[PDB]
Amino acid sequence: PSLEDIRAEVGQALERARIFQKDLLAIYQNMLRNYNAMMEGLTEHPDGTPVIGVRPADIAAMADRIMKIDQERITALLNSLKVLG
Amino acid sequence: SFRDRVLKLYLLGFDPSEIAQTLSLDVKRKVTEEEVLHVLAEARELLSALPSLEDIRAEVGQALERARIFQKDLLAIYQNMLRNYNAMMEGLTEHPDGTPVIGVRPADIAAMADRIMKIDQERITALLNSLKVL
Amino acid sequence: MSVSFRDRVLKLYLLGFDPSEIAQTLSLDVKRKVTEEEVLHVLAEARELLSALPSLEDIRAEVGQALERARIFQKDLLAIYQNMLRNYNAMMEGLTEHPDGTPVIGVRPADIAAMADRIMKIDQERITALLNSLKVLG
Amino acid sequence: MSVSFRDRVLKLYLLGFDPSEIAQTLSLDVKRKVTEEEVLHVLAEARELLSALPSLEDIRAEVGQALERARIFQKDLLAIYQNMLRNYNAMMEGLTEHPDGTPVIGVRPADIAAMADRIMKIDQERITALLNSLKVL
Amino acid sequence: SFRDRVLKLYLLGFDPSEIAQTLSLDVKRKVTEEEVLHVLAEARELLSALPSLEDIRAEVGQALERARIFQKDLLAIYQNMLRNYNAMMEGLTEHPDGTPVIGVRPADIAAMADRIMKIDQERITALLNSLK
Amino acid sequence: HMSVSFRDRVLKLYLLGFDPSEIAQTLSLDVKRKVTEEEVLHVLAEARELLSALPSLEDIRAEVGQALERARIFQKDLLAIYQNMLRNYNAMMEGLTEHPDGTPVIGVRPADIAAMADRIMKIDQERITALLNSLKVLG
Amino acid sequence: RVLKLYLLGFDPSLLSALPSLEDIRAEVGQALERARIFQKDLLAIYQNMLRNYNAMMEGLTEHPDGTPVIGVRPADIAAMADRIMKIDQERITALLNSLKVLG
Amino acid sequence: SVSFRDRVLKLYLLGFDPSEIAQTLSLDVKRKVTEEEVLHVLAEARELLSALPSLEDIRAEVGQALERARIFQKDLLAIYQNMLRNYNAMMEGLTEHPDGTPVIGVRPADIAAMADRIMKIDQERITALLNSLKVLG
Amino acid sequence: GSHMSVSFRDRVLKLYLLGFDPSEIAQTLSLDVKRKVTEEEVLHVLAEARELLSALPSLEDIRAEVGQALERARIFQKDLLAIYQNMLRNYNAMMEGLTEHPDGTPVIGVRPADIAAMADRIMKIDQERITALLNSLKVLG
């Protein structure tokens, strides 16, 4: 394996992590949707589906998982730059 | 768009043969395994490039803005946790607007406060690090 | 178009909406039909602005706002800590109800210590953040 | 445009209300109509003030206050610790009720040790903070 | 004493206006915000002084005597736990003195031993620093 | 490979915590003769000496390669499972107890999905990268 | 009676002075001895844990002496072993450190 | 003689005191084993245990540890495959495999945890092999 | 071979280290030695014991400690290995439907994660051995 093989693996990993991040971002909006519905007393959404219970801590934990993906991306990009100097 | 879709399926576990047949049925034309391998190899070259520090800063900036959006959500949730706590204290099972008072523990409020404060901390750390690379 | 328009393209990109979804959602707020290509170009302009080196003066402003936000929470937690002690002492003297008619809620010594710790950490974090602002000069 | 007014603008901004919500929430309180632009200006001036370089002397004052606050908590925890022992000792010799009629509440040994450790950690953290304010010179 | 009570209420979470109102009613005169802020400012000035290392040895010292007292409590509890474990091992639900057998896990006993040992370790370390 | 399999079987059972006498009595079946406690102790002493040998660089390269092969496999297994978790999450979100193929909808929490995503990202970014960097360094 | 009550958090209504190296050496010695005493207690408990695990393996709810078989998990036994081995390790570290700094 | 001494050492290291050891071995083979015989055996054991390892001894330990971990890895790999098998059956409705054995449900997190444990054995193996060159011989 | 003077010393020290007051130690041991032992004697005994325990180890003592610790760990490791095998046996029995082993004993459920955890405890004992052996060759030779 060359240095270009390992940089490609990292680049591909970071691109895959962006896919996961996007899935989690969609889940986070579902979590808010359910929370805000539970707040204003609905037991059922407009679409007929049930208002699922969501704890504030779960929402903050999801936000953190999403923010950590950015951080890990930033750290990986910095570390590949560090091999020069 | 075709180059992006090939990459995406490769990254979700599809091998180049499977990508060739799957994408042959999305568009009209028959694409080959070798054409998929060529498209992936070109994306590998792009993805293997050394990043620029300017691009890294743009990622920090975007990440920090994303964190601010979440932080604003959590700040609203925090107010609603206090509303429910201050109601739960007064013995109410029900708010003035009729919605139920949800149970909230002291630890949960402290934990949410900590989550919001950590977002400020991470923002300051990331900003200082962008300067520290000088 | 506007300052608010570019802000909303960024927000929706950062919430995970793909370009075409951002386009349609913004077409409703203005006269024209916003396209994918107009969205990608506003996003790329936003990335350009976000690549700027920070100002340490601006960083100190973020520290100040963060520490002030922490003082607000700290004041909330301090009141909650007193409520926790009120519950604990009512529990100690055998009461199911407070003098104001409200229910006594069960509180463990570990919960009270944890809350005290959370409050003390906020001071610690303030001191650390203030010191880090001076440390970066040297 | 008072200090009580300006502090309230900053507080609501830090609690997650946007400038227009802040404008309206201040408008309906006083016989007055406050704008967004005015709220934005107050916040901008608060950022300028908050961008000041800190003072190590002020930081020592924060360390002093933090240690005093920690003493207050340590005193509360010491009292709780004595209650825990009282209940453990009563629970040890069979009782469900103290001399004065108050109930014997269940205390585990691990809880007593954990509380002792919390109290001792406040002593230790006192010293570490005192050493750091000198060591930063 | 008035400066201490102002500081104390501030540190318990009262804002300067709440301190002013509540203390006005206690001392029977208009105590104003300006006065409370001024009294807090003075209390900060005293607290902003550099610590002496002769004082830091007094704090390093009194920590260790308090820790000794806790250690002695924990040691007595540790004996109670073993007494309970050895009874519960050999079938009993009641001790020689009529007091009940209370359940104890092996892990609980080990954790308590570890707490007691940690106090000795912390004492040694802090005695070495009390010379340093 | 009759003496080598006997040697390996003795070591394996020693490494799984069997008494030398239990090893002797067990392996007497495999080799159709009365193996003694003294023999297995001698076999273990000889195995100890062999295991004190240093690995060659080629030994290590092969070990790294076998480990890289395992990591790729695990990464693909978890990707399929992750997608099945999303399928279940989405079905659940729209009120279905049953999938289009007649199989039941199993409950899945947002945290479970995030955790699985992290498992996969750690394989990509830590496990595989470290093994690749070891291959490079070894030549 | 006087100082003990102050340090336990009651209000009224030298200990700042340095110890000798001799005293610190004595403190180290006593700590290590106390640890040996605890170690011996845990070793006996470890044996009773295995006896219970072994009876639990053979379906017994009662040992030969009539006493009840108490449920023990493999993780609990491993953890207890770990506690006992840690006391040894902490002894070795403290002994080395005493030669470094208290000779 | 050799089995006898090993058993004295074992019981000592298990927290049995010399008097108790002497008594328990006096019954194991019927003769009055003294405390002073036990203490002589244990003093001789301490001497042997005091001996430093050679570098060769350490390499052998590294080698045996690698092999032990490999044996565990293969057990874990077999358990992983089985957990997969049961995930994919529980997925498509089933409560019984083709061979009659029951389907036992498995959580995704548990499958991922097992993968991670197997890969952890791998990084420990590679680290130990590399440290065999960089640290030993 | 009598050793009752040292037994008295050890027991005074032991009870002190378990948190008994000198006066209680005196009252308690008066039974053992059939003699009226005073607080003051117990205090002198503790003071003498403090002096003795303040003696430094030799390097030879530390070598011996290391060696005993590693042997003790070998013993626990062997217990854990036997427990590991039972766990596997039970897991495999459960996998193929059995409620009872060939020896008549009941199949008791086990989680894969707990088998993994036990293997790791056993593997850690090896690495801790290697670490301690290396350290002894470094600093005690």
Swiss-Prot record, chain A:
Q: Where is the signal peptide?
A: none
- Tree of life domain: Viruses
Residue intervals passing through the bilayer: none
> Can the keyword DNA-binding be found in this entry's annotation?
yes
Keyword line: DNA-binding, Viral genome packaging, Viral release from host cell
**What family does the entry list?**
Belongs to the P23virus small terminase family.
Its assembly, as annotated, is: Homononamer; forms a ring-like structure through which genomic DNA is translocated into the capsid. Heterodimer with the terminase large subunit; the active complex is probably heterooligomeric.
Reported function: The terminase small subunit binds to the packaging initiation site and regulates the ATPase activity of the terminase large subunit. The terminase lies at a unique vertex of the procapsid and is composed of two subunits, a small terminase subunit involved in viral DNA recognition (packaging sequence), and a large terminase subunit. Both terminase subunits heterooligomerize and are docked on the portal protein to form the packaging machine.
Designated name of the protein: Terminase, small subunit
Give the organism's phylogenetic lineage: Viruses, Duplodnaviria, Heunggongvirae, Uroviricota, Caudoviricetes
Q: Which residues of the full protein are shown?
A: 54 to 138 of 171
UniProtKB/Swiss-Prot annotation, chain F:
Can you state the subunit structure given in the record? Homononamer; forms a ring-like structure through which genomic DNA is translocated into the capsid. Heterodimer with the terminase large subunit; the active complex is probably heterooligomeric.
- Please give the organism: Thermus phage G20c (Thermus thermophilus phage G20c)
Any keyword DNA-binding? yes
Q: Which UniProt keywords apply?
A: DNA-binding, Viral genome packaging, Viral release from host cell
Sum up the protein's function in the record's words: The terminase small subunit binds to the packaging initiation site and regulates the ATPase activity of the terminase large subunit. The terminase lies at a unique vertex of the procapsid and is composed of two subunits, a small terminase subunit involved in viral DNA recognition (packaging sequence), and a large terminase subunit. Both terminase subunits heterooligomerize and are docked on the portal protein to form the packaging machine.
Would you identify the family this protein belongs to, as annotated?
A: Belongs to the P23virus small terminase family.
Q: How is this protein named in the record?
A: Terminase, small subunit
Q: The organism sits in which domain of life?
A: Viruses
Full protein segment contained here: 1 to 138 of 171
Which residues form each disulfide bond in the chain?
none
Q: Does the keyword Phosphoprotein apply?
A: no
Q: Which GO terms describe its molecular function?
A: DNA binding
Swiss-Prot record, chain I:
Q: Key word Secreted present in the record?
A: no
Gene Ontology MF terms in the entry: DNA binding
**Keywords, ordered alphabetically:** DNA-binding, Viral genome packaging, Viral release from host cell
Summary of the function given for this chain in its UniProt record: The terminase small subunit binds to the packaging initiation site and regulates the ATPase activity of the terminase large subunit. The terminase lies at a unique vertex of the procapsid and is composed of two subunits, a small terminase subunit involved in viral DNA recognition (packaging sequence), and a large terminase subunit. Both terminase subunits heterooligomerize and are docked on the portal protein to form the packaging machine.
What subunit structure does UniProt give? Answer: Homononamer; forms a ring-like structure through which genomic DNA is translocated into the capsid. Heterodimer with the terminase large subunit; the active complex is probably heterooligomeric.
The similarity annotation says: Belongs to the P23virus small terminase family.
What is this protein identified as?
Answer: Terminase, small subunit
